[PDB]
Amino acid sequence: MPVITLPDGSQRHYDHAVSPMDVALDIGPGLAKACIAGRVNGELVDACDLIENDAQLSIITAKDEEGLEIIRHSCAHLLGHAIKQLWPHTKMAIGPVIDNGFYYDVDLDRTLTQEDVEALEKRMHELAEKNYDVIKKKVSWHEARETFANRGESYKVSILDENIAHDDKPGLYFHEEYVDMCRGPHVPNMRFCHHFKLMKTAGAYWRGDSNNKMLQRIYGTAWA
Ligand SMILES: Nc1ncnc2c1ncn2[C@@H]1O[C@H](CO)[C@@H](NC(=O)[C@@H](N)CO)[C@H]1O
C-alpha cells in the first residue's frame, strides 16, 4: 500500500504495488504516452518497475536529459537486435551511451564495409518503426547467465562471470527475439527511438587487453 507523492505535492494512495506507467496513466493519457521512465526516491527505474512502498515519484519524458540518455542507450540495443538478424553469429560485447550518442563493440567474422554499416542502419530503422514494446524481466545472476549461454553470447557470459556479483539481479530487456542485459532504464517502446544514425567504426581490444580479440566498435548518435 505505497503512498505516491508527485513533484507538485499531489498524493495518491494505492493498496497495491504500482509502476511509474500505472501512475502516469492515472494522471492522464498524455503523460502516459510521454512516459519513458521514472525516478523513485531519487533512483531511475523503468516505467514498468513496481513501487511497493511509499515514495516520491517523478515521470521522465523525452524533454528530460535523462530521457535523451535512455533513448540513446536503447538505440544500442536496437543495433544489437538488427545486427543479430543480419549476421546471427555476431557476439555482442558492451554497448554504452557516450556524450552525444552510443556505440556497441561486437565480435563478427566479417570486417564491416561502409555498405555493411548502411545495411545495418537500414535494418535498425525498419525494426524501430515497428514500434514494438521493450519487455523487461528482472532475473537472478544464474538465469541471466543461462539466457546468454543458450544464445552463445560469450562476452555477456564473461561479464557475468567476472564483473557481476552472484547476488545481483540483472535486468534483461527483450526486443522481439533479441535480448540484452542492463541496469537501464530503457525505453518502454521503440517509438521513442526513431531518430538516430550510425557513424564510423573503429577497432577496440576486448577489455583493453592486446592478448584478447580485437573487436569492431560501431558508433552512432541519437536524439529525441
Ligand atoms: N549488475 C548488472 N546488472 C545488469 N546489467 C549489468 C550489470 N553490470 C553490468 N551490466 C551491463 O553489462 C554491460 C557491460 O557493462 C552493460 N550493458 C550493455 O552493454 C547492453 N545493455 C548494451 O547497452 C551494462 O548495463
Coordinates of C-alpha atoms and ligand atoms in Angstrom, one line a residue:
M1 CA 0.0 0.0 0.0
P2 CA 2.5 2.6 -1.2
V3 CA 1.7 6.3 -0.9
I4 CA 3.0 8.0 -4.1
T5 CA 3.8 11.8 -4.0
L6 CA 4.4 13.7 -7.2
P7 CA 6.6 16.8 -7.7
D8 CA 3.6 19.1 -7.4
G9 CA 2.8 17.7 -3.9
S10 CA -0.3 15.8 -5.1
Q11 CA -0.5 12.4 -3.4
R12 CA -2.1 9.1 -4.5
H13 CA -2.9 6.2 -2.1
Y14 CA -2.7 2.8 -3.6
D15 CA -3.4 -0.5 -1.8
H16 CA -1.3 -2.5 -4.3
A17 CA 2.1 -2.0 -5.9
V18 CA 2.1 0.3 -8.9
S19 CA 4.6 1.3 -11.6
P20 CA 5.5 4.7 -12.9
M21 CA 3.5 4.0 -16.0
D22 CA 0.5 3.0 -13.9
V23 CA 0.6 6.3 -12.1
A24 CA 1.2 8.2 -15.3
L25 CA -2.0 6.7 -16.9
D26 CA -3.9 7.6 -13.7
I27 CA -3.0 11.2 -14.2
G28 CA -3.8 11.3 -17.9
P29 CA -3.4 9.8 -21.4
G30 CA -0.9 12.5 -22.5
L31 CA 1.5 11.8 -19.6
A32 CA 1.3 8.1 -20.1
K33 CA 2.1 8.5 -23.8
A34 CA 5.1 10.7 -22.9
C35 CA 6.4 8.5 -20.2
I36 CA 9.8 6.9 -20.8
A37 CA 10.9 6.1 -17.3
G38 CA 10.5 7.2 -13.7
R39 CA 12.6 8.4 -10.7
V40 CA 11.6 6.7 -7.5
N41 CA 13.1 8.1 -4.3
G42 CA 15.9 9.6 -6.4
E43 CA 16.6 6.4 -8.4
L44 CA 16.0 6.0 -12.1
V45 CA 13.8 3.0 -12.8
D46 CA 12.0 1.5 -15.8
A47 CA 8.4 2.6 -16.4
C48 CA 7.3 -0.9 -15.6
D49 CA 9.1 -1.4 -12.3
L50 CA 6.8 -1.9 -9.3
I51 CA 6.7 0.6 -6.4
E52 CA 5.7 -1.4 -3.3
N53 CA 6.5 1.2 -0.6
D54 CA 5.7 4.9 -0.1
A55 CA 7.8 7.1 -2.4
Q56 CA 8.4 10.3 -4.2
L57 CA 7.9 9.8 -7.9
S58 CA 8.7 11.8 -11.0
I59 CA 7.9 10.9 -14.6
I60 CA 10.8 11.0 -17.1
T61 CA 9.9 12.1 -20.7
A62 CA 11.9 12.9 -23.8
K63 CA 12.1 16.5 -22.6
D64 CA 14.4 15.4 -19.7
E65 CA 18.1 15.0 -20.1
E66 CA 17.7 11.5 -18.6
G67 CA 15.1 10.8 -21.3
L68 CA 17.6 11.5 -24.0
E69 CA 20.2 9.3 -22.4
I70 CA 17.8 6.4 -22.1
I71 CA 16.8 6.8 -25.8
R72 CA 20.5 6.6 -26.8
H73 CA 21.0 3.5 -24.6
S74 CA 18.0 1.8 -26.2
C75 CA 19.4 2.6 -29.6
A76 CA 22.4 0.5 -28.7
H77 CA 20.0 -2.4 -28.0
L78 CA 18.4 -1.7 -31.4
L79 CA 21.8 -2.0 -33.0
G80 CA 22.1 -5.5 -31.4
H81 CA 18.6 -6.5 -32.5
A82 CA 19.4 -5.6 -36.1
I83 CA 23.0 -6.9 -36.3
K84 CA 21.9 -10.3 -34.9
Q85 CA 19.4 -10.5 -37.7
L86 CA 21.9 -9.6 -40.4
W87 CA 24.8 -11.7 -39.1
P88 CA 23.4 -14.2 -36.5
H89 CA 26.8 -15.4 -35.5
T90 CA 27.8 -12.0 -34.2
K91 CA 28.7 -11.8 -30.4
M92 CA 27.7 -8.7 -28.5
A93 CA 30.1 -7.2 -26.0
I94 CA 29.5 -3.8 -24.4
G95 CA 27.3 -1.0 -25.8
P96 CA 27.3 2.1 -23.6
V97 CA 26.0 5.6 -24.0
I98 CA 28.6 8.3 -24.7
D99 CA 28.5 12.1 -25.0
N100 CA 26.0 12.6 -27.8
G101 CA 25.4 9.1 -28.9
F102 CA 26.4 5.4 -28.2
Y103 CA 28.5 2.6 -29.5
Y104 CA 28.5 -1.2 -29.4
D105 CA 31.6 -3.4 -29.6
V106 CA 30.9 -6.6 -31.5
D107 CA 32.7 -9.8 -32.5
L108 CA 31.9 -11.0 -36.0
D109 CA 34.0 -12.6 -38.7
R110 CA 33.3 -10.0 -41.4
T111 CA 35.1 -6.7 -41.3
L112 CA 32.3 -4.2 -41.8
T113 CA 32.4 -2.2 -45.0
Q114 CA 30.5 1.1 -45.4
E115 CA 27.8 -0.8 -47.3
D116 CA 27.5 -3.1 -44.3
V117 CA 27.1 -0.2 -41.9
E118 CA 24.5 1.3 -44.2
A119 CA 22.6 -2.1 -44.3
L120 CA 22.8 -2.3 -40.5
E121 CA 21.3 1.2 -40.1
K122 CA 18.6 0.5 -42.6
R123 CA 17.6 -2.6 -40.7
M124 CA 17.6 -0.7 -37.4
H125 CA 15.2 1.9 -38.8
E126 CA 12.9 -0.9 -40.1
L127 CA 12.8 -2.6 -36.7
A128 CA 12.3 0.6 -34.7
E129 CA 9.5 1.7 -36.9
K130 CA 7.5 -1.4 -35.9
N131 CA 7.0 0.3 -32.6
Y132 CA 7.4 -2.9 -30.6
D133 CA 7.3 -2.9 -26.7
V134 CA 10.5 -3.5 -24.9
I135 CA 9.9 -6.2 -22.3
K136 CA 11.9 -6.1 -19.1
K137 CA 12.5 -9.0 -16.7
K138 CA 14.5 -8.8 -13.5
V139 CA 16.3 -12.1 -13.1
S140 CA 18.9 -13.9 -11.0
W141 CA 22.6 -13.9 -11.9
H142 CA 22.2 -17.6 -12.9
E143 CA 19.1 -17.1 -15.1
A144 CA 20.9 -14.3 -16.9
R145 CA 23.9 -16.5 -17.5
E146 CA 21.8 -19.3 -18.8
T147 CA 20.0 -16.9 -21.1
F148 CA 23.2 -15.8 -22.7
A149 CA 24.9 -19.2 -22.7
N150 CA 21.9 -20.5 -24.7
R151 CA 22.5 -17.7 -27.3
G152 CA 26.2 -18.4 -27.5
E153 CA 26.9 -14.9 -26.2
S154 CA 30.3 -15.5 -24.7
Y155 CA 31.1 -11.9 -23.9
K156 CA 27.9 -11.4 -22.0
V157 CA 28.6 -14.6 -20.1
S158 CA 32.1 -13.3 -19.3
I159 CA 30.7 -10.0 -17.9
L160 CA 28.5 -12.2 -15.6
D161 CA 31.4 -14.5 -14.7
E162 CA 33.9 -11.7 -13.9
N163 CA 32.0 -8.4 -13.4
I164 CA 28.6 -9.0 -11.8
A165 CA 28.1 -10.2 -8.2
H166 CA 26.2 -13.5 -7.9
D167 CA 23.7 -11.8 -5.7
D168 CA 22.9 -9.1 -8.2
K169 CA 19.7 -9.2 -10.1
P170 CA 20.4 -8.3 -13.8
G171 CA 17.7 -6.7 -15.9
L172 CA 17.0 -8.5 -19.2
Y173 CA 15.5 -6.4 -21.9
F174 CA 13.7 -8.3 -24.7
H175 CA 13.4 -6.7 -28.1
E176 CA 11.3 -9.2 -30.0
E177 CA 13.7 -12.2 -30.4
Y178 CA 16.7 -10.2 -29.2
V179 CA 17.8 -9.9 -25.6
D180 CA 20.3 -7.7 -23.9
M181 CA 21.3 -7.0 -20.2
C182 CA 21.5 -3.7 -18.4
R183 CA 20.9 -1.7 -15.3
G184 CA 18.7 0.5 -17.5
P185 CA 16.4 2.2 -17.7
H186 CA 15.4 1.5 -21.3
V187 CA 12.5 2.9 -23.4
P188 CA 9.2 1.2 -22.9
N189 CA 8.6 1.0 -26.7
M190 CA 10.7 1.7 -29.7
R191 CA 8.5 4.5 -30.9
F192 CA 10.9 6.7 -28.8
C193 CA 13.9 5.6 -30.9
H194 CA 13.2 6.7 -34.5
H195 CA 15.9 9.4 -34.6
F196 CA 19.4 8.0 -34.9
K197 CA 22.2 7.4 -37.4
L198 CA 25.2 5.2 -37.5
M199 CA 28.5 7.0 -37.9
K200 CA 32.0 5.4 -38.0
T201 CA 33.5 2.1 -37.0
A202 CA 36.8 1.6 -35.1
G203 CA 38.8 -1.2 -33.5
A204 CA 39.0 -1.9 -29.8
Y205 CA 40.5 -4.8 -27.9
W206 CA 38.2 -6.7 -25.6
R207 CA 38.8 -5.5 -22.0
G208 CA 41.5 -3.3 -23.5
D209 CA 43.9 -6.2 -23.4
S210 CA 46.0 -6.9 -26.5
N211 CA 46.1 -10.6 -25.6
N212 CA 42.4 -10.6 -26.3
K213 CA 40.4 -10.3 -29.5
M214 CA 40.2 -7.1 -31.5
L215 CA 36.5 -6.2 -31.7
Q216 CA 34.7 -3.8 -34.0
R217 CA 33.3 -0.7 -32.4
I218 CA 30.2 0.7 -34.2
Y219 CA 29.4 4.4 -33.3
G220 CA 26.0 6.0 -33.5
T221 CA 24.1 9.1 -32.4
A222 CA 20.5 9.5 -31.4
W223 CA 18.2 12.4 -30.4
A224 CA 14.6 13.0 -29.3
Ligands
LIG1 N1 24.8 -5.7 -12.3 C1 24.4 -5.5 -13.6 N2 23.1 -5.8 -13.8 C2 22.7 -5.6 -15.1 N3 23.3 -5.3 -16.2 C3 24.6 -5.1 -15.9 C4 25.2 -5.2 -14.6 N4 26.6 -4.8 -14.7 C5 26.8 -4.6 -16.0 N5 25.6 -4.7 -16.7 C6 25.5 -4.4 -18.2 O1 26.5 -5.1 -18.8 C7 27.0 -4.3 -19.9 C8 28.5 -4.0 -19.7 O2 28.7 -3.3 -18.5 C9 26.2 -3.1 -20.0 N6 25.0 -3.2 -20.8 C10 25.2 -3.3 -22.2 O3 26.4 -3.3 -22.7 C11 24.0 -3.5 -23.1 N7 22.8 -3.3 -22.3 C12 24.0 -2.6 -24.3 O4 23.7 -1.3 -23.9 C13 25.7 -3.0 -18.5 O5 24.4 -2.3 -18.4

